[PDB]
Amino acid sequence: SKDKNRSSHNQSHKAHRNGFYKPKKSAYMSTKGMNVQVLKNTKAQRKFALAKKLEAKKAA
Amino acid sequence: SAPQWFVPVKAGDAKVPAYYPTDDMIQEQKKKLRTRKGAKITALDKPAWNL
Amino acid sequence: ATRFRQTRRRRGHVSMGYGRIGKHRKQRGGRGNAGGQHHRKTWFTTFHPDYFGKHGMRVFHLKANKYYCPSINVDSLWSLVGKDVQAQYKNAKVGEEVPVIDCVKHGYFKVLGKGFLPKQPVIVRARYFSEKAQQKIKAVGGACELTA
Amino acid sequence: AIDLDRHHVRKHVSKTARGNNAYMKLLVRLYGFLARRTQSKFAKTILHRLCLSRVNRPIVSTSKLACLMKKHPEETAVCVNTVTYDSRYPVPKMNVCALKFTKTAEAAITKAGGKCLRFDELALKAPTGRKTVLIRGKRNVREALKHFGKVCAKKNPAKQYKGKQTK
Amino acid sequence: IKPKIVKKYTGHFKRFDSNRFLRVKASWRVPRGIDNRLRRKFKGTNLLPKIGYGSAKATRNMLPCGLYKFPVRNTTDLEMIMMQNRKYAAEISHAVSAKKRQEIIQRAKILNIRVLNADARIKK
Amino acid sequence: MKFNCKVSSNPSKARKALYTANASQRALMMSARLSKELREKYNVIAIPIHKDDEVKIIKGHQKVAGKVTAVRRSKYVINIDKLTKTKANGQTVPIAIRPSNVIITKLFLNKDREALLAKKAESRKSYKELVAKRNEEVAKAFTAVYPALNMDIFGKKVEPITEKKPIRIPSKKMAEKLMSKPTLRAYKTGIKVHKAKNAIAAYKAALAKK
Amino acid sequence: AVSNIHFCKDWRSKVHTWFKQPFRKIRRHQTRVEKAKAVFPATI
Amino acid sequence: SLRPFVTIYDGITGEAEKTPVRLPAVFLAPIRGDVVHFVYRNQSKNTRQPEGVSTEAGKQHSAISWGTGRAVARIPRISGSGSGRNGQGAFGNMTRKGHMFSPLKNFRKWQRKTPKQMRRFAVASCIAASAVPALVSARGHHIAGVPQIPLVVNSKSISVIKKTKQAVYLLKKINAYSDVLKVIASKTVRAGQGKMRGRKIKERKGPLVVYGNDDLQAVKAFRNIPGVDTCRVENLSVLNLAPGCHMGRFIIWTESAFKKLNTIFGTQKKMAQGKSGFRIAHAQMAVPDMKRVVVAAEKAKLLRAKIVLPKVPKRANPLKNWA
RNA sequence: CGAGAAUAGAAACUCUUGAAGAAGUAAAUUAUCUACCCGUCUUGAAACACGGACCAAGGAGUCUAACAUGGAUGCGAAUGAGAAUAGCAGGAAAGCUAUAACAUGAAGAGAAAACGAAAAACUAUGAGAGUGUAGAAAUACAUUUAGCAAUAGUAUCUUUCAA
RNA sequence: AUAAACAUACUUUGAAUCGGCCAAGUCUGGUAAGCAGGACUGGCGAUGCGGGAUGAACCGAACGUCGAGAUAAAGUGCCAAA
RNA sequence: AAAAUGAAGACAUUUUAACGAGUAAGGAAACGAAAUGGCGUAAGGACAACAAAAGUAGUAAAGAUUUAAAGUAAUUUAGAU
């Protein structure tokens, strides 16, 4: 009972029925695995800016 | 006044509801069918529009 | 309601919505969780990836009453006595009578520190306390009591 | 024939009050009339949110209303959902319009000096919406959303419906 | 007045093979066979009920006399259509006795309503 | 309703006990009513029927009056010498009659019907004095609450309350929106039919006055 | 969810149904009343 | 909450009492027909008795299939010989004198659970509909002549009713006898196999007499009247106030039962006393009316004018049509 | 000669057939065109593939239990407590009532010991509300304001060898 | 440049299915096969209608019920409309 | 699909526009502008002459045979025996 091994027939027609799902913009903006020193500078500034912004909030 | 849908007719002494008037006050109206006007008669000299 | 089932809508259809090529046969791969490692391994890997194996040490007879410890955060402490009492003792300080919150009497043994307490002195009585729970109660001007 | 990309199928938007609630049916009747005549996007928004399913109309507690109304003192918060009570935190004075108020939430809002309105009164008072703040509750806080997906996934695993010998 | 009632198909949609076998009745059943000559819509045998056969919405369910049927069981049930005698026609039910039929037939003459069973259960 | 849990309200069990009842319970079932002349003399409503009694058929084709010649309890029927039918070849056969279609007009009282009739008479009197004691007790309570009225008002005509005080309730606007389509359509049709009946009545009254 | 259902034995002979429950109340109540009538400080 | 007044009538003399009673707050609860349907669909099943076929019905044979090679089907066959039964069909569901499809078991689910607060919601909604004359009559009651649709009778007149002649007299005084005679005149017999099981007569529904704790001796008089059902004020349910899932039952309240309503159900602002944990709900609409909003919006000059759709002209051929 | 515009003008008809049966519809027959045996497995059956002589009645996704999603319902940091069980009227397998053990949830991580959550948050885009102008019918721009849901990314905090 | 608001992005739950077959300005093994196996596309399966006399795939063209016209593949001595 | 109207009419509203082939398979009920529309079998609770005798029935029920009518269809309705 030998059977047909494999065929790519109708495969492309299936893939385009619901087309190639592009990724969202949030995928292109991930930061895991970036430069170690670059992330340290960014964290330092974001911590500095948040503390200053919070200080004004407590002041007013 | 009578409703537009109420055309009272005489009852041969048969049972009638309370609201149905007694035939002594019911006057029949002759059934009317024709509603269109016949063709008007014009001058013997003038011709019809449908010429 | 058997008149809302799908069997009443599939009367007249030969296969009753189960397919002509692949019939509705007795089994579909075994009874129960059969083939957990052989042909339904892709199912267990996908949806229960730690089903097979061992982890942790056995407790031959577990005393489940020894782990019973209901917890309440600090922000939820005043709800045990209600808002009417909370506003009534709102302007108290050291020296005069202050309401006591009996956490144990309400079924709560441990008091945790989460959220913010209202700025009123209060005496909290419970069996266990957290480090931040006592800090928040004391920073507001209150006290902590032990029990049992 | 004609080469259409896809055939005509029902648009998956609800346009009436789901269920047989006589009062919710009248509210949709009132705001479908208001949005059609006044042509105000506020009545269009309220009408659309009145026709969502119960799961898609999440609750908003009094703590969330208090925080969102902090810099809106003389305003009427408008949330098309049930307003529950957050017993952890106090309730300030504010006016809320909502479909239904919890027994404790209504007392807390009233006892603080605020007001609890219905949607019929809001349309009578502010039909197009002038001193109102539109608020909706959080949808992702449902526990059902934790188990959606593949628990073997490397990035965002699911949460493994508990069952036989779950460790 | 009476509109022209137009029927798109005056025949009957008979069941498939109902003419050949007496166990297969004439009530219509859509053939669900995989090789059925009719459901495949062959030439000759391609007659199936479809929504396109429906008659005009204006004249649907209208009797040839031009009025809509209305079943009545007693003289009181006639009073529900006495305002619409130009639209509805009475219809004495098949189980109404001959005595109650005379009252219905007489009363409808008083109220000027057309009865379609005026010649039913008449005595010898 | 029946409140005795021993007795059964099952029709099938009732018929079975009728078919399988013994002769003792069959005699007490085939009872007939006494006539006015006999009722006044004995103060007894009905007694079980007996042979040689004289009865009068009141229901059936022939309302003859004869004598009881056979009390057949297996068939639950009786026979009269006057009701017979000729059996083709010439001999006559009696016609069975149910005992509930006749009334007794002349007793056959030897010695124990006399004792039964006395017992049946005293039972009627004893119950009557008991009902009288209850009715007086019921009436004594009515005059304690309404001292100005007497108990005969319940047997005479009743005058309804004609006052029509209405009530304002903030749901009557919603009434039409709280019915389903089948009961809303019927309700609206009843309103339309009622209005048209009033229209015909109004038109008739105008003609009658004029 | 992995199912853990112990219906592989003859549960049909293990089924206990509570059709006698509305009559346990009448039994126990009546006996409870009978005790009070007999000697009241025993049902005490 | 002005809560308009309600008059109390004397059953014997027909005289209204001099002291009106405020309408209980339970008559303003939202009338939710969907909530009642949920409760009534469940509660109507709670009276069913267990039934089931014999466990060994149709399985009392030692039959085995004959197999193939005998020109007969493979359904099992009765063993032995000498009778017509042997060699016939066997246990199979389609065979004659065999077991049916999945046999009905006596441990089926007969009674249905329902939350208490949903059951109390339905009774309050059913009580409210009993005070709407449109809903009461549309259900099939003759209430054209009654003075007040929340019909109340004096507690003094109720205390004197000991016989069915008095109860009938009272029902005539308050013009409630139209419904009783509708039931009497329309009594008939059931259509179908229900007569074999004992259910022969099929009567209609009439007034419901709701009484308090002080009217326990007047119940005996009303019970024999055809089409008159009595209930205590506390024991109300959807099975009484909405028979057949048609809300709006005609109810004859008594003075003792009418006054206890406020304690049993509470108000829309006070928690109930008789039914602990339950409070009357607030409808989704404060005033279930839309006219007052439209006119106010019209007065503020906000609504546009009503639009009649223009008649779209039919297509023409400009090359062939000069006009 | 002539568009726009201003000013005045004009359309209501004939014949035939029909309760001696019109128009339509139905049944039978005839005539032209048209029509392979249904159900099923199969790439493919009208198949020289199998079941089917005919008719009537019976005949096959049901019930119990655990979980999940989903649409309608009640209540909502609680919900359920028709858990057993205990009372009420009525006589009741129905109905009503019981400040209540517990179930699920409000707190999560760790094998376990031991623990147990705020910087009263930040950023981005986003729902809604006004004023003015104009087209001019609806509508289209300018500008002030709020920034919920959702998504993504940040600080901060509990637990873990490890988030 | 062109198209796109009954556009777009989806989320959840689930059915059936993974025996395939044909064509070819295609390929591999084979002398070859209505043989065996592949790349791309279109079809048959799941599909009737007009033409090729007849045909699962060829050519035209895909179907709610009808009337009137202009057509497509292809045809005009008769069967058979021209 | 979009506009208009909307407590009750009615034919499940009015107008305009686009569309309608199909095996396996899906579209549970309810949801006034209705998140597909309906026919039939049997049983249970209601409703059925609104003015105090309230659906039909010995002046002929159910059933059976046929003749016609309504519906695209499932089927329903009526006459005669």
Curated annotation (Swiss-Prot), chain B:
Gene Ontology molecular function: any one: RNA binding
Keywords of this entry: Cytoplasm, Endoplasmic reticulum, Ribonucleoprotein, Ribosomal protein
The UniProt record lists the keyword Cytoplasm: yes
GO biological process terms held by the UniProt record: cytoplasmic translation
Compartment list: Cytoplasm, Cytosol; Cytoplasm; Endoplasmic reticulum
GO cellular component: cytosolic large ribosomal subunit; endoplasmic reticulum
Keyword Cytoplasm: yes
Main location per the UniProt record: cytoplasm
Tree of life domain: Eukaryota
Record's subunit section: Component of the large ribosomal subunit.
Family statement: Belongs to the eukaryotic ribosomal protein eL6 family.
Function (record text): Component of the large ribosomal subunit. The ribosome is a large ribonucleoprotein complex responsible for the synthesis of proteins in the cell.
Name of the protein in its database record: Large ribosomal subunit protein eL6
Source species: Entamoeba histolytica (strain ATCC 30459 / HM-1:IMSS / ABRM)
Taxonomic classification: Eukaryota, Amoebozoa, Evosea, Archamoebae, Mastigamoebida
Curated annotation (Swiss-Prot), chain C:
Gene3D superfamilies to which the protein is assigned, alphabetical: 3.100.10.10
InterPro entries given in the database record: Ribosomal_uL15, Ribosomal_uL15/eL18, Ribosomal_uL15/eL18_sf, Ribosomal_uL15_CS
Subcellular location: Cytoplasm, Cytosol; Cytoplasm; Endoplasmic reticulum
Pfam family name, one: Ribosomal_L27A
Keyword field: Cytoplasm, Endoplasmic reticulum, Ribonucleoprotein, Ribosomal protein
GO BP, one annotated term: translation
Family per record: Belongs to the universal ribosomal protein uL15 family.
Function: Component of the large ribosomal subunit. The ribosome is a large ribonucleoprotein complex responsible for the synthesis of proteins in the cell.
Protein name: Large ribosomal subunit protein uL15A
Organism: Entamoeba histolytica (strain ATCC 30459 / HM-1:IMSS / ABRM)
